[PDB]
Motif scaffolding. Structure first.
Motif, short mmCIF file in Angstrom:
data_model
loop_
_atom_site.label_atom_id
_atom_site.label_comp_id
_atom_site.label_asym_id
_atom_site.label_seq_id
_atom_site.Cartn_x
_atom_site.Cartn_y
_atom_site.Cartn_z
N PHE A 118 -10.50 -53.99 -10.97
CA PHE A 118 -9.57 -54.18 -12.05
C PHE A 118 -10.02 -55.34 -12.89
O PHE A 118 -9.92 -55.30 -14.11
CB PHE A 118 -8.10 -54.48 -11.54
CG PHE A 118 -7.44 -53.29 -10.79
CD1 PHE A 118 -7.89 -52.02 -10.96
CD2 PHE A 118 -6.29 -53.50 -10.03
CE1 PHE A 118 -7.29 -50.95 -10.28
CE2 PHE A 118 -5.64 -52.45 -9.39
CZ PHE A 118 -6.15 -51.16 -9.53
N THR A 122 -11.03 -55.06 -16.66
CA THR A 122 -10.21 -55.76 -17.65
C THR A 122 -11.13 -56.51 -18.58
O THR A 122 -11.02 -56.46 -19.82
CB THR A 122 -9.15 -56.66 -16.96
OG1 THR A 122 -8.27 -55.85 -16.19
CG2 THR A 122 -8.38 -57.51 -17.93
N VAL A 189 -9.15 -46.46 -16.47
CA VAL A 189 -8.01 -46.73 -15.60
C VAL A 189 -7.74 -45.52 -14.67
O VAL A 189 -7.48 -45.69 -13.48
CB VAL A 189 -6.76 -47.07 -16.45
CG1 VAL A 189 -5.55 -47.26 -15.54
CG2 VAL A 189 -7.02 -48.30 -17.31
N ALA A 255 -5.66 -51.82 -17.94
CA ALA A 255 -6.35 -52.49 -16.82
C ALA A 255 -5.74 -53.83 -16.46
O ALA A 255 -5.73 -54.21 -15.33
CB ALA A 255 -7.85 -52.63 -17.07
N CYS A 258 -2.92 -53.18 -14.33
CA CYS A 258 -3.38 -52.92 -13.01
C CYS A 258 -3.61 -54.23 -12.29
O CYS A 258 -3.15 -54.35 -11.17
CB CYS A 258 -4.71 -52.11 -12.98
SG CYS A 258 -4.58 -50.45 -13.70
N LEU A 259 -4.38 -55.16 -12.91
CA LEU A 259 -4.75 -56.40 -12.28
C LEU A 259 -3.46 -57.13 -11.89
O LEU A 259 -3.40 -57.79 -10.85
CB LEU A 259 -5.55 -57.30 -13.25
CG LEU A 259 -6.18 -58.58 -12.66
CD1 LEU A 259 -7.17 -58.20 -11.59
CD2 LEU A 259 -6.89 -59.35 -13.76
#
Ligand SMILES: Nc1ncnc2c1ncn2[C@@H]1O[C@H](COP(=O)(O)O)[C@@H](O)[C@H]1O
Ligand SMILES: [Ca+2]
Ligand SMILES: [Ca+2]
Ligand SMILES: [Ca+2]
Ligand SMILES: [Ca+2]
Length: 449
Positions: A118, A122, A189, A255, A258-259
């Motif tokens: 991630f 990112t 993603v 992203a 997500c992180l």
């Protein structure tokens, strides 16, 4: 200079490593330092899709990616038949093999892995690079050490170069819109979401014996947590996967989201301990020295630390970096350094209250550390400032730095040649130039008085 190649003068080819979509990958060796590298050799005439000048500008942006989970590239060189893209060598093999070996990962182990994917993605997306073919075969383990960093490889060349022209299992990771000719940030993603689903379950979410049936499933976007092993996985991990495999890309999370998902945070609580104090003490000693030196000293050191250090040399600083990197984005911001320094003190038994606070110190240090002005201290900037100056001053490393700057190969750096590195001087014999021996004094003097 007529009988010297750019690639061949500096490196010797040791053997072949592999061959994928673009060009071919060999192991090479620096003929002075003996340090080993991965080089991607691309045939100009077959493969070029853009003029050279375009290609060098695009590759230069790839060299500037500095993130612990993104492949490190050191240079692009050329001869009459090829481009040579020289990177850091990773020895741990593909994440794919680790899936085979392990079959499935716990939530803790999967989170520690996917969090790095991630982070790396990112950072790519912030620099406007989409991967396009993210999958476990295109992520390498830095080494065979346990919990070593992962490295995202194999991206950035698809507009500069034409492909070589039967990859098995690639259909598993494709987003549905890819079947419509679309690649964009959100496709990465989705691919990362398929990877996560496999880390947790051992099995592709869109599954099938052959490429046809798989592609049929992908296309509907239909998948389930129906396999028995899913009953035992937390709702939080499922919530994250649902957000990543959302059919419509405009509804699909970024992203960064997500992180930042709470399931990641739940397993990324790594933080300095008592056992890290020796590392932390050393890092801080060296960072004060750095703050002290001329902007010119600081400049030359960043250049040398970013080009010529090795994995073994930085692994402990790598670990300290990771523990200070609270939000897992692969870089240290101002608050992270202030907390980190407060935590160092607490661990040591020293009260922060004790002429100049931690916050003033960090504030005055950021501009010197953040040498590219990015708003953050990236990996290489931290290593430059936190490593033992000594280590960089090996004779072979100075020789290679000297040769990087002696453009004409006269044996002596001119003023014009020398700026390259930093972008008054002291000459002992007073030719207005720097032969090697003076250059060694110059670099040696940077660390010293
Ligand atoms: N930096 C690297 N270190 C070690 N092996 C690599 C590296 N880059 C690529 N390879 C291997 O070379 C092959 C082709 O890479 P690629 O075409 O970029 O996917 C695959 O086996 C990779 O694992
Ligand atoms: Ca951070
Ligand atoms: Ca920076
Ligand atoms: Ca010269
Ligand atoms: Ca001289």
């Amino acid at each position: 200079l007529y009988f010297q190649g750019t690639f061949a003068e500096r490196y010797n080819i040791v053997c072949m490593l592999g061959k994928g979509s673009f060009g071919e990958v060999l192991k090479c060796k620096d003929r002075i330092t003996q340090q080993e590298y991965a080089v991607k050799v691309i045939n100009k005439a077959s493969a070029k899709n853009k003029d050279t000048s375009t290609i060098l500008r695009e590759v230069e942006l790839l060299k500037k990616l500095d993130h612990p989970n993104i492949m490190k590239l050191f240079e692009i060189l050329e001869d009459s038949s090829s481009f040579y893209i020289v990177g850091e060598l990773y020895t741990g093999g593909e994440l794919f093999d680790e899936i085979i070996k392990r079959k499935r990962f716990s939530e803790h182990d999967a989170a520690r892995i996917i969090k790095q994917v991630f982070s790396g993605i990112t950072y790519m997306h912030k620099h406007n690079i989409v991967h396009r073919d993210l999958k476990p075969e295109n992520i390498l383990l830095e080494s065979k050490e346990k919990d070593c960093d992962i490295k995202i490889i194999d991206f950035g060349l698809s507009t500069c170069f034409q492909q070589n022209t039967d990859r098995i299992g690639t259909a598993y990771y494709i987003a549905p819109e890819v079947l419509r000719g679309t690649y964009d940030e959100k496709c990465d993603v989705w691919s990362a979401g398929v990877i996560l689903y496999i880390l947790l379950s051992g099995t592709p979410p869109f599954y099938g014996k052959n490429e046809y049936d798989i592609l049929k499933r992908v296309e509907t976007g239909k998948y389930a947590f129906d396999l028995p092993q899913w009953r035992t996985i937390s709702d939080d991990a499922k919530d994250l996967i649902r957000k990543m495999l959302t059919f419509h890309p405009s509804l699909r999370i970024t992203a960064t989201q997500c992180l930042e998902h709470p399931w990641i945070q739940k397993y990324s609580s790594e933080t300095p301990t008592i056992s890290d104090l020796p590392s932390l003490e050393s890092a801080m000693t060296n960072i004060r020295q750095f703050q002290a030196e001329k902007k010119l000293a600081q400049a030359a050191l960043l250049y040398m630390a970013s080009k010529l250090t090795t994995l073994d040399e930085t692994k402990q600083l790598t670990e300290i970096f990771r523990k200070l990197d609270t939000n897992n984005d692969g870089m240290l911001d101002r608050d992270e350094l202030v907390r980190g320094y407060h935590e160092f003190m607490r661990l040591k038994g020293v009260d922060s209250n004790s002429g100049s606070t931690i916050e003033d110190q960090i504030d005055s240090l950021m501009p010197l550390l953040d040498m590219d002005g990015s708003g953050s201290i990236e990996y290489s900037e931290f290593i430059a400032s936190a490593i033992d100056r000594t280590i960089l001053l090996s004779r072979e490393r100075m020789e290679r730095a000297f040769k990087m700057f002696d453009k004409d190969g006269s044996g002596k750096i001119s003023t014009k040649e020398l700026f390259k590195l930093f972008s008054e001087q002291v000459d002992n014999n007073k030719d207005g130039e720097v032969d090697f021996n003076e250059f060694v004094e110059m670099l040696q003097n940077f660390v010293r008085n």
